[model samples]
Structure formats: C-alpha cells, structure tokens
Target: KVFGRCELAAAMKRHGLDNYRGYSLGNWVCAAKFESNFNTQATNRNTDGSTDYGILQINSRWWCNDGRTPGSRNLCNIPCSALLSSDITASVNCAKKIVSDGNGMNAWVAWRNRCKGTDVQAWIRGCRL
Candidate 1:
C-alpha cells in the first residue's frame, strides 16, 4: 500500500504530472503538507461549521451548492464524488485544477518562499523540467 510522500508522488504521476519537478512538486507538496499533512482521509471543519473532507480538503458545501452532493444522481461538471475517489489520479487532477484555477498554489508558493527565507521566484530557478 502507498503512504506519505510516495502516495502523494504517485498521485501526481498518475495524473499525468510526470514533468512536475522543482516548483511543480514543491507547490503540490506544500499544499498537501499544509492542508492535511499528507493524510489521504483527512477532514476538517470550517469556521462556518461547514465540512471540508478528503485529501485535498474539498468543501462539501460547494458540492451541495452545485447540486452534486453525494448520492444526488446528477452529473455536474465538477462533482465532489469525482474528487473523493480512491483513485489517486482522479483526486490529484481535481486538486491540481482547483489550485490552478483558484490561484491558491501561487499564493502558497509565495508563502513557502517567505517562510523558507528565499526569493519566491528563484525557488525553482535551476530545477525546471
């Protein structure tokens, strides 16, 4: 069975992320590290008492808003069920899309760079793939 960083890396690779080096994996790992400590089955409560669940910590309420709640039988474009699947590839793709679209990963990279005492843009300078 896969676990920890290996599992996370496998998830990345399975999602067609073979070219992810330097800031790619670094960004993904940063989010996973911050969000769930790499826990695949993590869940957390929001300040509003809404539930965020799973490895990517998706907000279940968002799914509800989109009418894609578990067992809803509707086929939404962005379904939470798709994100929560045991197939790491599915989950990772969903997570990557979310991060890319929401611009959260860029913010995360900036934060990580500040915390690590390095220039944010230069963090991945010599490590491109």
Candidate 2:
C-alpha cells in the first residue's frame, strides 16, 4: 500500500521506468492507478479464482507462482508475493519482464481496458516530477 501518483512515478523512474521501455509515462501512471491505485500490496480476484498482483496486476496464470494458484505460465520466474512486496525489486523486474515477454503495453489487461485510448496526463497533474 505505497506510492502516490508522483511518488510512484519517481520510484518508477529510479527503477528505469520513467519513459518505461518506450511506453509513455502516462501509460505507466494510468495503469498503476487503475490496476491497484498504486498500491504494491494490491490484489484483485478474477472470476475463475486467480488473482492479479502488484500495481500492474500481473496474473498468476501467466506471470508467476501465486501461492494460491496453479498451472501458471511462470514467465517471470518470480513468486507472486514478490510483486506484492514493498521492496519492489522483484516487482519491477517481473513487471518489465512481462511486457518484454508479451506485446507492448497491451500486455496488461488493465491498460487495454482502462488506460488505453484515453488522455491520462491528469493522472500526474500538479505533482512535481
């Protein structure tokens, strides 16, 4: 449960995510806001019982081992809890690894569902970056 919009932006920048692998800064900002409201510990349950992890909501079915889930693609090679941690080393790594493994920002359902095809500059408005 950490990071405001600007604070998370700073943290992401420090982790090499300001421009973020060629995706717009707004993409990261908006996705984090919608996926988890920028909380690292955020968890969202899907209808099938699998859950989304971390700010980007990486799912256990494809990204990693969710202690609570099985039959994962495990592409990120990390524990789902790592994405939920405050330290965020594995979180950032796994997140980046995921986008790399898949397509662009389209890798995240949250992004396509909410952040895509919209103006998201307001997500970081007034915060001194």
Candidate 3:
C-alpha cells in the first residue's frame, strides 16, 4: 500500500484534520484511491500549458512560487512546495484553503463523493471552494 494508513494518518494530522473519521475517512480514502492511485510523485497535463505536478496533483505552473517563475507568489500559500509536494497531504491543504479556507471539511468530502463516479474531472466542479 503506497498510501498506507500511517501515511494517510500522518498527512491528515499534518493538515490539522483531527475530526476525520467514519464516513469522512472513508470518503478521503476513496478519493485518494481513485486519484493518482495514492502516488505521491504523480504528474499530469491540463489543456493549458501548466502541469499538474507532485502528489496531490498540484498545478506547478499555477501554484509554484519558490522563485521557479516570475510573478509567482505561491498562489496556494503553501510553503516548502518541494518537500510537501508528495501527495494529497500538501495538495489537500491547498485545496482546503481554496474551498473554505480551512473552515470545514465539506470540500474534501464532496470531492470524494463526486469523484466516485466515472467522470473524475467532475469532482473539480463539485468543490465548493
């Protein structure tokens, strides 16, 4: 299990996700299972020139602000993008901010439920962020 329980648990805790349990955990697990197969080093390409790089599938061209490009200011405000760029951990934190600024876990939950179907991309639209 590339994304073993320990890894997921650590990731959750790192992102201040202590309330995740029962259905929430299940939902997160299900989403991770489907997205990137829990691969931390996964990468993909969007219609735009930007590349979804690293674990949580962060768009490097859009979120990277470590002086990689000009006028980049950490669009996600997540530091150490290289170190935390492993998987859902960092990306989820970033996503959480975009959705509700860490107010609630609804964004994560909705993504899981929405992506359960065939059209994974639909999950993006499901985000209330």
Candidate 4:
C-alpha cells in the first residue's frame, strides 16, 4: 500500500514512533519518503545480496530474516516477507527494535542524509498527530 503523507504520519503515531528514541514522527515519515515513498511493498537488493524490505526498508542482513542474507542476525526475529504487508505492524515493530537497539535512526541512510538535524516537523504539520 502507498500511504498518503498524513496517513503514514497517523499510522506511525499510532505505533508510538513519535519521539521514540528522540526521533520525531515526522523524522520517520521523512525517512520513509526517501526510503520507500510510503509504499509497503518496496524492496531494494543490496550489493551485499541482502535485501531491504517494506516502507522503512528494514534490512534482511541485521533486522529481519530472509534466509538469503549471509550472516543475518535477524534481531527482529521476523520473516523479511512480513515487512511488505500493508498492515505495517511488522515493519513498525522491526523499526522500533532497530532504533532501540543503540543503532538509533542512523540505521537508515534516508534519515541520516535527509531528515536528521533538519526541521522535519514540516513533514507532518497538517497530519493532526
């Protein structure tokens, strides 16, 4: 599913990503825009052969297990395929695990390159969340 900006914002808020680990809800929304454009089925195959999946692009190498990435940690203990659903429960939970695990939001290049240190609150200004 491709989410509207406000829709994604509302959903992320519902999942408690707002101010999670000091990252704002808009930060996650901004990262998702660059990473997956808010599409739940987005995927990217890395040069390392691991794949990034879903809206926040949770990676198979360290987060989710696809059984194809070499030396996968599968810290989220969820199948990589679970990240692609429109429901977003798995993707949000995995993203929470990633940030809470000391990696912080820097685990996502999109957040680092685009959202970090900027006034990302604009991304969700009218979202009403």
Q: Which candidate is the best by TM-score?
A: 4
On residues 36-120, what C-alpha lDDT tens digit does candidate 1 reach at each position? 6666666666665555555656665543222434443222245554554566565565555555554554534323553344333
Tell me how many clashing residue pairs each candidate has.
0, 0, 2, 0
TM-score of 2: 0.86
Clashing pairs in 3: 56-87, 99-129
lDDT agreement of model 3 with the native? 0.50
Cα lDDT tens digits for candidate 2, 1-129: 778788887777678766667776778889888888888989888887788888888888888887777666778888788888877677777878877774878877779989888987777678777
Candidate 1 lands at a TM-score of: 0.56
lDDT for model 2, please.
0.80
Best by lDDT: 4
Who is ahead in lDDT, 3 or 4? 4
Per-residue accuracy of model 3 over 14-77 as CA lDDT, tens digit each: 6654444322443454455554566666656556445554444555554655444444446676
Give Cα distance to truth, residue 20, candidate 4, Å. Answer: 0.8
User: What are the lDDT scores of the predictions, listed in order?
Assistant: 0.50, 0.80, 0.50, 0.91
Worst 10 residues of 3 by lDDT: 120-129
Residue 71, candidate 3: Cα error in Å is 8.1
Better of 2 and 3 by TM-score: 2
Considering lDDT, which of the candidate structures 2 and 4 is the better prediction for this target? Answer: 4
For every candidate in turn, the CA RMSD to the true structure comes to: 6.2, 1.8, 8.2, 0.9
Q: What is the TM-score of each candidate against the true structure?
A: 0.56, 0.86, 0.53, 0.96
Error of 3 at 46 (Å): 1.1
Ten contiguous residues with the weakest lDDT in model 2? 17-26
* Candidate 1 off by > 4 Å: 18-23, 63-85, 102-129
